Design a protein around this nucleic acid. Structure first.
Length: 606
RNA sequence: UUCCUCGUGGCCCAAUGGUCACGGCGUCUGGCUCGAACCAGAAGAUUCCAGGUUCAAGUCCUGGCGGGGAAG
């Protein structure tokens, strides 16, 4: 046997334990292949079980320290001296065609993959599976429900709601790529005093004809004014006669039955959902079901109430049903689940909704993409499902995120998301016209500008970890130089130009290129880069951070761009021209994959 | 007042507990006779403070300070 054989032995090798081996996928992750190899070999040298070595292998910070490394201390070898072991094991390590070099360094052992070896396997793999390159089957017939955005249709959809939307869109695409069935659910906040306020407000300032001219502009004007009332008349006018109370009243009429209200409501409900469907689509998102606070009946809600008692979780307080979660967690406190008047509160509705979902979908996992401002709530909610004894309770997860600051209707700082997009599109359109020759070759400058701007908007948000807050600033959405959406778009766009620029050669020929011709440092760094996308995605699903992907995407595009200035595809020998076309080709495919994963839309020209 | 969360270069920000902290912006020097929305090079750090756990801390623990959030 030999090299093509070692690969087989390594692909059908579960050196990892029943737990971690479910992570080893030598077949679709070059780094895993190496993890296997390195483990098998280092075991033969060290005497240490390979299952102990595998998880001790770490991907490096920068590509200067190798492709993987292992901290000897981690192996916990009694009385040993890591620095010596490193040296010993390192100088004796079999490189073969896999590794380029193994070098001891302090208590660590670094492993430098052989770029040639990588090239021959990764590019073809990438060029062949294309949109499925990063893919990996991490789950066996599992269904997940991801509830995201879930806005209150009675309030302006501003820049702040961009977050729960794109994050949820991301997790959805990510989960699918790793083998999950995904239900994209928008849990619309469409049943309460808030809508009441909007309805009342429409009587006060609404104008049926202006509504038709531009529903949204008018409705916003309505929202604005009616809200000035609640503010201006603070604690004066007695409830029944005040605006606020008048709003609560309108909701009563609905929750009561008033066929008159349930009509103006349903009218709004249908319309809003239509307006939303376009917006989400403009962000490459298509919900499977548009649920909502309304969709959870008093049946499901009360059935839950009984369960709280049935399990001895509630206590009576002057007619109100409460739940003191202290027993379970001091920080959780007490929660009102139903008030004296009988009205079940939102904490109870959420539990209803939950149970309803488990019944209808029998999901293996449900992800709640809410904002950090609902941390306590989310926690209580989860705790309750636990103590209710639901098996699935343990399959619920809350993915939070920081807030976009600088959005206030009463401060006039408010700016709708549809407009943020639009305004950015126009700006991107102008920079696009700065280059006549090129601009001329674009068929739909408008469509493309909007794609470019959206990438700008999305990336600037996904660059840092969800948890981080950030100040709304137009310059954040309008920048195109440096690490910005436009940067990725331009890289993708120029890699395509290079392709078109050499139609003379086609993909089929790329896969069988003489990869040995990709020996330059720049090409090596880029090759190594290419084989990490698979690890990136799997790590992405652990951190649930768009930034996990975006960070990679820039290292990739950065390296690509470096290469772009030294490795020409044009004016070369057909042999070298095909070699680099396969390199840039794969690079483009990976960038394509990642961008889509994040929810952006690659552009061919800009 | 109680709880949570963030604090990394002048500004934004990354990091599996694993070595001498990744990028962008600003700024300095260069490069337009397959896309310069770019590239090459330079300078800028003790990762908020006092400690602690650990072979190893930006990362974990306690407390302080500051911003944000939540509860009362």
């Amino acid at each position: 046997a030999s090299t093509a054989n070692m690969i087989s032995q390594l692909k059908k090798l579960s050196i990892a334990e029943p737990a971690v081996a479910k992570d080893s996928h030598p077949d679709v992750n070059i780094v895993d292949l190496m993890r296997n190899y390195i483990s098998q070999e280092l075991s033969k040298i060290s005497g240490v079980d390979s299952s102990l070595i595998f998880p001790a292998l770490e991907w490096t910070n920068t590509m200067e320290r190798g492709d993987l490394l292992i901290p000897i201390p981690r192996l916990r070898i009694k009385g040993a001296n890591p620095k010596d072991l490193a040296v010993q094991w390192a100088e004796k390590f079999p490189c073969g065609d896999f590794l380029e070099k193994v070098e001891a360094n302090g208590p660590f052992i670094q492993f430098f993959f052989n770029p040639q070896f990588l090239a021959k396997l990764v590019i073809p793999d990438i060029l062949t599976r294309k949109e499925d390159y990063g893919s990996c089957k991490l789950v066996e017939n599992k269904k997940v429900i991801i509830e995201f955005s879930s806005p209150n249709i009675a309030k302006p959809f501003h820049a702040g709601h961009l977050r729960s939307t794109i994050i949820g869109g991301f997790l959805a695409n990510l989960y699918e790529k790793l083998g999950w069935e995904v239900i994209r659910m928008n849990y619309l906040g469409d049943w309460g005093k808030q809508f009441g306020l909007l309805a009342v407000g429409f009587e006060r300032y609404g104008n049926e004809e202006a509504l038709v001219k531009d529903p949204i502009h008018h409705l916003f004007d309505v929202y604005v004014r009616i809200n000035k009332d609640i503010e201006e008349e603070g604690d004066s006018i007695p409830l029944e006669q005040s605006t606020n109370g008048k709003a609560r009243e309108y909701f009563k009429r609905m929750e009561d039955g008033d066929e008159e209200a349930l009509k103006i409501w349903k009218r709004f409900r249908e319309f809003s959902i239509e307006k939303y469907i376009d917006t989400y689509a403009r962000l490459n998102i298509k919900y499977d079901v548009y649920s909502g606070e309304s969709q959870v009946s008093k049946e499901s809600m009360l059935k839950a109430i009984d369960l709280f008692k049935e399990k001895g979780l509630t206590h009576e307080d002057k007619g109100a049903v409460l739940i003191d979660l202290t027993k379970f967690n001091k920080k959780l406190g007490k929660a009102i689940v139903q008030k004296s008047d009988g009205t079940t509160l939102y904490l109870t509705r959420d539990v209803g909704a939950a149970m309803d979902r488990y019944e209808k979908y029998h999901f293996d996992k449900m992800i709640y993409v809410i904002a950090s401002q609902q941390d306590l709530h989310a926690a209580q909610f989860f705790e309750i499902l636990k103590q209710m004894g639901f098996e699935w309770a343990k399959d619920l997860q809350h993915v939070n995120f920081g807030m976009v600051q600088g959005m206030s209707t009463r401060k006039g700082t408010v700016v709708f998301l549809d407009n943020i997009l639009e305004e950015t599109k126009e700006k991107m359109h102008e920079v696009m016209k700065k280059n006549e020759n090129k601009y001329a070759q674009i068929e739909h400058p408008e469509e493309v500008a909007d794609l470019v701007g959206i990438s700008a908007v999305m990336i600037q948000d996904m660059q840092g970890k969800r948890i981080n807050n950030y100040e709304f600033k137009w310059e954040r959405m309008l920048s195109f130089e440096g690490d910005t959406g436009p940067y990725l778009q331009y890289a993708h766009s120029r890699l395509r130009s290079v392709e078109r620029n050499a139609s003379g050669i086609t993909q089929e020929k790329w896969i069988n290129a003489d990869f040995s011709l990709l020996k330059e440092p720049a090409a090596k760094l880029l090759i190594r880069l290419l084989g990490q996308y698979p690890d990136v995605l799997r790590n992405a699903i652990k951190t649930h951070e768009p930034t996990t992907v975006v960070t990679y995407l820039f290292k990739l595009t950065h390296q690509v761009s470096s290469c772009y200035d030294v490795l020409w595809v044009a004016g070369q020998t057909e042999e070298l021209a095909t070699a680099r076309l396969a390199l840039y080709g794969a690079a483009r495919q990976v960038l394509y994959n990642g961008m889509r994963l994040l929810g952006l839309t690659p552009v061919e020209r800009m």
